[PDB]
Design a protein around this ligand. Structure first.
Ligand SMILES: CCCCCCCCCCCCCCCCCC(=O)OC[C@H](COP(=O)([O-])OCC[N+](C)(C)C)OC(=O)CCCCCCCCCCCCCCCCC
Ligand SMILES: CCCCCCCCCCCCCCCCCC(=O)OC[C@H](COP(=O)(O)OCCN)OC(=O)CCCCCCCCCCCCCCCCC
Ligand SMILES: CCCCCCCCCCCCCCCCCC(=O)OC[C@H](COP(=O)(O)OCCN)OC(=O)CCCCCCCCCCCCCCCCC
Ligand SMILES: CCCCCCCCCCCCCCCCCC(=O)OC[C@H](COP(=O)(O)OCCN)OC(=O)CCCCCCCCCCCCCCCCC
Ligand SMILES: CCCCCCCCCCCCCCCCCC(=O)OC[C@H](COP(=O)(O)OCCN)OC(=O)CCCCCCCCCCCCCCCCC
Ligand SMILES: C[C@H](CCC(=O)O)[C@H]1CC[C@H]2[C@@H]3[C@H](O)C[C@@H]4C[C@H](O)CC[C@]4(C)[C@H]3C[C@H](O)[C@]12C
Ligand SMILES: *C(=O)CCCCCCCCCCCCC
Lengths: 71, 128, 88, 81, 220, 122, 166, 171, 124, 127
């Protein structure tokens, strides 16, 4: 629409590109990967796990107060 | 071999699958000749006045007048009280009124009983 | 909306240009007034594909009541110009 | 302003996926009469388009280049304090 | 609310797996997202539902503007079956479109992750309807399927649009408008999650197979 | 989950019922059992305006974290240490709930064996 | 408090001025679409000031400024609830709308009624903010039905299309 | 009334359009487009009006079973998402006759150049009416097709609204 | 074809096929393009219900009966599964959470005068 | 199937008329004839002042129009609103209600100087 550089359409051909259009598009795409990697290294627990999930099948019967079978 | 198309009142039979679009006799071909003959005569009268440069107004359409007239004024003079009209009149005229009377009368009788007993929660009910 | 307008010269060139990519029409026997049937000897099925090849070029459908009446590139240009308000 | 339509002799079905369509139609005695009309979609700037996996990886080359230094810069800085 | 949302996210996402119009596909995505929000209310996580509203606005709004850019270039064409080859013809629209489709699918640490993946994890670890939970997990899978449909049928392959198209996105208004949401769509989730004061007890410890389920199902 | 299969595709009397736990006396098996202590008083939580679901034993860590956040403004990346402390404190509270759950499961099965032994001989 | 409440209400009043000026007070059709967009830009900035205060000290307040109607034991007042939900959604909605309007100037450049289109878009924004900031149900209902009616007028924007009216 | 050729050609156009929607990819469509053409070329010469009819009816029933549920539509074609879009900008020509004189004064050339068409239209009307009423059979016209002008200086009968119809992107 | 003379007031108004205006040819040159009508054409008794903004009777790709069976089956199946999933909830292996000061009796609006029933939780 | 002999003539006859009609729809260079209009003295200044690019002096117009906007759309409304709130709304009971500030153990109250006693010693653990 109105505004911006007037680019002549090319018939049956790949459309023209500018320098700022190509460069800036690349800048933000690279920003995503930089942002994902930087956070993935500082907040690795956010995507994998925060604290260990203890296995209930290993706790002893005295810490849980389970009397022996006889009494 | 395919499932033959089944047509309901809201899913019209496709013209392509309609057998009437292939078996063309002399009458069928001639029948369309007269349909387009009347359709052509009407399309002529409209264009004589539609294109006329000395006309400013509305082209009265007798078809439109007849449509509205039958929908409003020609109904009662063509009404006969019979089994169909009488039964439908009561079912659709009096049925809903009786239905809603017992729905509301039963509900208010139930509620009025609770309030007198004191079993209906009206702790902060001061707007009515 | 920001689209360049279509002109008679622009329409005609694209109309011929489409046929020149058709393997069953000789480029040297192709003219603005070359009949598709009586000159190029194309069957009606090819004629239908010609209309289809034009719809994809200009991106607008053409009625089958009117697609049958277009037999030469001159008539295709006239229809498109009439159907898109083209005067120069 | 008149627009210069390219010469139509440069559009060919050779070396593109349209050729393999010719081979399979050839085995049945059939040929594609519009193949050259649809050929422009496979040649020029549209030829050899990126893949889905590569498309999602756009810009990763520079991003990881800046990531390693960023943590490396912090590594030295955090060593001091 | 849980069951009503669960069917909505599954049904609407299911209807988006075979749609052709680009605007229709995003619409069925929005209904799928709203169904997920209703599920969040049904698991008694009202603040996560709100946090998803704020985050969802950025990229869902961007995905429509980016699609609007494509539609204008092809002269008011919306069916993806007449698109393709726009990865390099419209590099800026592709970047935002790809970035948005990764927040919708819930890539870690983007804006969508801080609400979406935080809800599915909170859904698994709650006393809740089992079928509703399953339908939500299946729906999250469908989010990636139709998100990839737009990318594949609008950026990859070979172009299917007509011979003459004015593919131009060099307008400062269009570029700037998309640019801000692109910035927000990347950082909005992180900024909000670290500033909002806590109001509940979040769930952080859970089985290994319920902590990556949101990510694992998305990849599949 | 996995324990559902042991309650739905299996015996239900051998599994805990979260709507009925605890089903055994708290002191049963614990001679002079200790009681959890709340560091934060009622007034401190009331004046701190914590959500009722946060007015728990794990409080007095949330208060400290909230106090830091009000003080580190606009530095919103700070106070991370207090977050982990409260995250850890809540985590210990969560595991203890699992311990109560595993304790419940074992006691129920213990009642099973005891009843069967005296039942079979009869 | 004074700054918090004053900057919370100015956000709403700022969005009304473009609508008020449509009564041929200051006339500039060429830049009216730009005029609406610039108002949204400033509305976002002002709304952030209450937002930052809430982030700092968790400050929230109610503003029952105008006593509209009193039906016996039901006092209805124009009440705005500036709290967690309103303080956070207003910046986001304005930030997104800011981008939508700038996009619209390009997408709708060739629309003859672009001035009407931008008035309708701003009318929706005002109604949504009434919906978001409502403190009582009746005020919430005004925004509730307001967004619906503005949706009807914008969905059927191209009214020569029988399939858009439907 | 449609002839057998007309119906056959239409089925060929629809099948490719639905087949085109099915294939999406051009090369895949090109492969299957020709095979569909082959199935049609093997019955072109059939001179049996009955066996040929059975083929068309069976051909249509096969199209219905395989038609795309959501076929591609051109935006301005009936069903595409631009049909009737700009009908809200198409104003009839007679509205200009109601403009205030101070408003016609903004376009003196257009309205000066407009009286000519109104002058031209009135003059041609009488001839156009006379031409139709003499070429019309006793019982009235049998079709909607209209004759052209058979002289020089005479415009075709019933041209005013066809010629003056609103443009396609008026605003 | 006049309507049946059953006394419902139709008189001699023609009965036309119950076909929506959406079916009529969209490319033919109609006198009234939006209504798909010709000046002088007899209008259907229910024209205002069959306008293009209302009930549409055009042929559908899938038979009407098969559409209802599939949609009803989908809704019927989903409702049953939600009921199946309601009695069999999926939860986590943890007992009821514990809150101090007698399960927050005072915080939850408990009566200050009537001393609450003591509630005690033990370290574990 | 193609056009009958007469049809090709009619379309040509109309297609010539139609293409002539579309040419009449063009506007002459003078049109539209705008009646004489007067601008304010401020408007005339910027018409010629801004002709030169001069990026250094072009931002002045940007700040000029934004400076006016902030004064007429932000400063005036906040003056009216603040005056309205301070002397008409806040003078009525419960018109503006604030959620009371949170007091943490260790804070100092600005109304009396009271210091809320800190919390007891924690069983400190580094995890
Ligand atoms: C107790 C609940 C309230 C009961 C009342 C509401 C129930 C519906 C009864 C009123 C429906 C008819 C309204 C008058 C006619 C206007 C609508 C119309 O003509 O239909 C055209 C439209 C057709 O629009 P369309 O989107 O389906 O397709 C139009 C055709 N194309 C796409 C080609 C352009 O249908 C409707 O929108 C109305 C149907 C929805 C209402 C029925 C669902 C009710 C909810 C059930 C759960
Ligand atoms: C969270 C959960 C929320 C769930 C919400 C969604 C619930 C959806 C429930 C499933 C709905 C499935 C639809 C089932 C109804 C189907 C009705 C039907 O098929 O019959 C319509 C009937 C067709 O038959 P008919 O037209 O008479 O045959 C041709 C005669 N010329 O044609 C007629 O109209 C005739 C009159 C019968 C009308 C139908 C009965 C009413
Ligand atoms: C109360 C409802 C009564 C319905 C049962 C009576 C109708 C009936 O059974 O038909 C009897 C008779 C038709 O008999 P038949 O001989 O076949 O036809 C007459 C030919 N001369 O019918 C007749 O001929 C005369 C009609 C008598 C019945 C008319 C009154 C019935 C109620 C009409 C509907 C009232 C609607 C009121 C609306 C309320 C507000 C909405
Ligand atoms: C016929 C009108 C008279 C009638 O039938 O209504 C009588 C009915 C009461 O009659 P009943 O129920 O037998 O006596 C005990 C009432 N507590 O009246 C009542 O009080 C109960 C409501 C009766 C609802 C049916 C009314 C008839 C339908 C309306 C008339 C349509 C003509
Ligand atoms: C139920 C919820 C839904 C209700 C919606 C109903 C539709 C209403 C449409 C929106 C109306 C916007 C309302 C905001 C404007 C307030 C109008 C006003 O100021 O009224 C006078 C008001 C005092 O009113 P009050 O004391 O509360 O009692 C009134 C009982 N009828 O205030 C005053 O005392 C006047 C103080 C004026 C100070 C500013 C003057 C300088 C500015 C002048 C130029 C502007
Ligand atoms: C500030 C904005 C953009 C200017 C720019 O940076 O280019 C411009 C564009 C149109 C202007 C507005 C419109 O012209 C309408 C009004 C006209 C006068 O300028 C007074 C205020 C008025 C409300 C203007 C305020 C401001 O100067 C506006 C909003
Ligand atoms: C249980 O409480 C939640 C219901 C199970 C949902 C997750 C299903 C996936 C885990 C089973 C596969 C394990 C191997 C990865």
């Amino acid at each position: 629409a109105g505004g911006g550089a007037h680019i002549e359409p090319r018939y049956r051909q790949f459309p023209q590109l500018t320098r700022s259009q190509v460069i800036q598009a690349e800048f933000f795409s690279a920003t995503m990967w930089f942002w994902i990697l930087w956070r993935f290294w500082h907040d690795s627990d956010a995507v994998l796990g925060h604290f260990p999930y203890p296995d209930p099948s290993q706790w002893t019967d005295e810490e849980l107060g389970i009397p022996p079978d006889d009494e | 071999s395919f499932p033959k198309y089944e047509a309901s009142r809201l899913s019209s039979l496709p013209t392509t699958l309609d057998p009437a679009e292939y078996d063309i006799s002399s009458e069928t071909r001639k029948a369309q000749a007269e349909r387009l003959a009347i359709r052509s005569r009407l399309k002529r009268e409209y264009q004589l006045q539609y294109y006329d440069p000395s006309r400013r107004g509305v082209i009265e359409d007798p078809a439109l007048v007849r449509w509205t007239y039958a929908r409003s004024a020609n109904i009662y003079p063509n009404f006969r009280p019979n089994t169909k009209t009488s039964l439908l009149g009561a079912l659709f005229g009096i049925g809903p009124l009786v239905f809603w009377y017992y729905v509301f009368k039963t509900d208010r009788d139930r509620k009025e009983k609770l309030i007198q007993e004191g079993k209906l929660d009206r702790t902060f009910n001061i707007s009515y | 909306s920001d689209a360049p307008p279509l002109t008679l010269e622009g329409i005609k060139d694209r109309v011929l240009y489409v046929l020149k990519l058709y393997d069953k029409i000789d480029p040297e026997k192709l003219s603005v007034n070359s009949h598709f049937m009586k000159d190029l000897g194309l069957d009606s099925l090819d004629q239908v594909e010609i209309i289809m090849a034009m719809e994809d070029e200009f991106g607008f459908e053409i009625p089958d009541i009117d697609a049958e009446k277009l037999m030469c590139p001159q008539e295709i240009v006239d229809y498109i110009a009439d159907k898109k308000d083209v005067y120069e | 302003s008149k627009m210069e339509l390219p010469d139509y002799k440069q559009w060919k079905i050779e070396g593109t996926p349209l050729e393999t369509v010719q081979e399979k139609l050839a085995a049945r005695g059939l040929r594609d009469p519009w193949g050259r009309n649809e050929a422009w979609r496979y040649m020029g700037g549209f030829a050899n388009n990126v893949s889905f996996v590569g498309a999602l990886l756009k810009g990763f080359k520079w991003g990881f280049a800046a990531f390693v230094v960023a943590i490396g810069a912090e590594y030295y800085l955090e060593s001091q304090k | 609310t849980l069951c009503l949302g669960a069917i909505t996210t599954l049904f609407t996402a299911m209807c988006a797996l075979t749609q052709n119009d680009i605007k229709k596909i995003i619409a069925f995505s929005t209904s799928s997202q709203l169904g997920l929000m209703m599920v969040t209310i049904g698991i008694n996580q009202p603040y996560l539902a709100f946090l998803h509203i704020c985050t969802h606005a950025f990229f869902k709004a961007m995905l429509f503007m980016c699609s609007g850019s494509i539609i204008h270039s092809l002269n008011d064409e919306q069916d993806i079956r007449k698109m393709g080859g726009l990865f390099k013809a419209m590099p800026f629209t592709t970047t935002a479109l790809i970035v948005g489709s990764l927040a919708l699918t819930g890539m870690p640490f983007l804006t969508g992750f801080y609400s979406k993946d935080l809800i599915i994890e909170a859904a698994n670890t709650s006393y809740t309807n089992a079928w509703a939970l399953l339908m939500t997990l299946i729906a999250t899978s469908f989010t990636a399927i139709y998100s990839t449909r737009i990318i594949f049928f609008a950026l990859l392959g070979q172009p299917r649009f007509p011979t003459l198209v004015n593919i131009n996105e060099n307008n400062p208004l269009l570029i700037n408008s998309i640019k801000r949401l692109l910035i927000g769509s990347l950082f909005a989730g992180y900024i909000i999650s670290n500033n909002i004061p806590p109001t509940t007890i979040p769930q952080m410890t859970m089985p290994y197979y319920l902590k990556t389920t949101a990510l694992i199902v998305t990849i599949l | 989950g996995a324990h559902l299969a042991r309650r739905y595709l299996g015996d239900a009397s051998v599994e805990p019922d979260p709507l009925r736990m605890p089903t055994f006396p708290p002191d049963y098996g614990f001679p002079e059992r200790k009681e959890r202590e709340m560091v934060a008083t009622q007034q401190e939580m009331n004046d701190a305006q914590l959500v009722l679901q946060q007015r728990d034993y794990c409080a007095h860590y949330l208060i400290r974290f909230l106090k830091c956040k009000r003080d580190s403004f606009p530095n919103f990346l700070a106070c991370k240490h207090e977050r982990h402390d409260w995250d850890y404190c809540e985590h210990l509270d969560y595991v203890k709930r699992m311990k109560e759950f595993e304790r419940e499961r074992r006691l129920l099965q213990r009642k099973k064996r005891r009843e069967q032994r005296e039942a079979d001989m009869a | 408090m004074n700054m918090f409440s004053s900057l919370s209400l100015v956000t709403l009043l700022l969005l009304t001025m473009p609508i008020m000026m449509m009564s041929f007070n200051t006339y500039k059709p060429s830049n009216y679409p730009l005029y609406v967009k610039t108002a949204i830009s400033y509305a976002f900035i002002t709304s952030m000031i209450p937002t930052m205060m809430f982030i700092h000290s968790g400050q929230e307040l109610i503003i029952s400024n105008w006593h509209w109607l009193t039906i016996q034991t039901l006092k209805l007042s124009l009440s705005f609830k500036m709290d967690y939900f309103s303080m956070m959604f207003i910046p986001v909605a304005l930030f997104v709308t800011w981008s939508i309007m700038e996009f619209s100037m390009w997408y709708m450049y060739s629309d003859p009624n672009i001035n009407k289109f931008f008035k309708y878009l701003l009318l929706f924004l005002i109604t949504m903010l009434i919906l978001v900031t409502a403190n009582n149900l009746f005020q919430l209902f005004i925004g509730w039905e307001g967004v619906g009616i503005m949706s009807f007028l914008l969905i059927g924007w191209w009214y020569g299309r029988a399939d858009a009216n439907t | 009334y449609l002839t057998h050729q007309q119906k056959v050609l239409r089925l060929y156009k629809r099948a490719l359009r639905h087949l085109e929607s099915w294939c999406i990819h051009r090369d895949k469509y090109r492969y299957f487009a020709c095979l569909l053409r082959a199935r049609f070329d093997e019955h072109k010469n059939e001179k049996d009006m009955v066996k040929a009819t059975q083929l068309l009816r069976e051909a249509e029933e096969e199209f219905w079973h395989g038609q795309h549920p959501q076929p591609y539509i051109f935006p301005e074609s009936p069903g595409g998402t631009s049909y009737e879009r700009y009908e809200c900008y198409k104003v009839p020509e007679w509205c200009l006759d109601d403009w205030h004189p101070s408003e016609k004064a903004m376009y003196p050339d257009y309205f000066a150049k407009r009286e000519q068409w109104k002058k031209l239209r009135r003059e041609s009307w009488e001839r156009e009416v006379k031409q139709l009423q003499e070429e019309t059979p006793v019982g009235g016209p049998r079709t909607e097709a209209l004759p052209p002008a058979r002289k020089q200086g005479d415009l075709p009968p019933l041209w005013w609204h066809i010629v003056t119809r609103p443009r396609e992107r008026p605003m | 074809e006049p309507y049946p003379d059953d006394g419902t007031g139709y008189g001699d108004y023609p009965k036309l096929p119950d076909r929506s205006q959406q079916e009529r040819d969209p490319w033919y040159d109609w006198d009234h393009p939006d209504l798909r009508l010709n000046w002088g054409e007899p209008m259907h008794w229910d024209l205002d219900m069959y306008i293009r903004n209302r009930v549409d009777t055009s042929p559908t790709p899938v038979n009407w009966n098969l559409m209802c069976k599939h949609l009803f089956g989908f809704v019927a199946f989903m409702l049953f599964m939600f009921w199946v999933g309601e009695t069999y909830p999926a939860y986590q292996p943890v007992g009821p959470k514990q809150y101090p000061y007698n399960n927050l009796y005072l915080e939850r609006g408990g009566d200050p005068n009537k001393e609450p029933e003591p509630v005690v939780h033990y370290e574990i | 199937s193609g056009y009958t002999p007469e049809e090709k003539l009619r379309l040509q006859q109309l297609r010539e008329l139609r293409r002539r009609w579309l040419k009449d729809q063009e506007l002459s260079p003078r049109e539209p004839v705008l009646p004489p209009q007067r601008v304010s003295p401020v408007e005339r200044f910027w018409n010629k002042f801004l002709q030169d690019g001069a990026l250094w002096k072009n931002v002045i117009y940007k700040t000029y129009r934004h400076s006016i906007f902030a004064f007429t759309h932000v400063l005036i409304p906040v003056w009216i609103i603040h005056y309205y709130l301070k002397y008409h709304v806040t003078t009525k009971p419960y018109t503006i209600v604030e959620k009371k500030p949170r007091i943490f153990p260790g804070d100092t109250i600005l109304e009396t100087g009271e210091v809320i006693p800190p919390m007891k010693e924690f069983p400190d653990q580094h995890h």
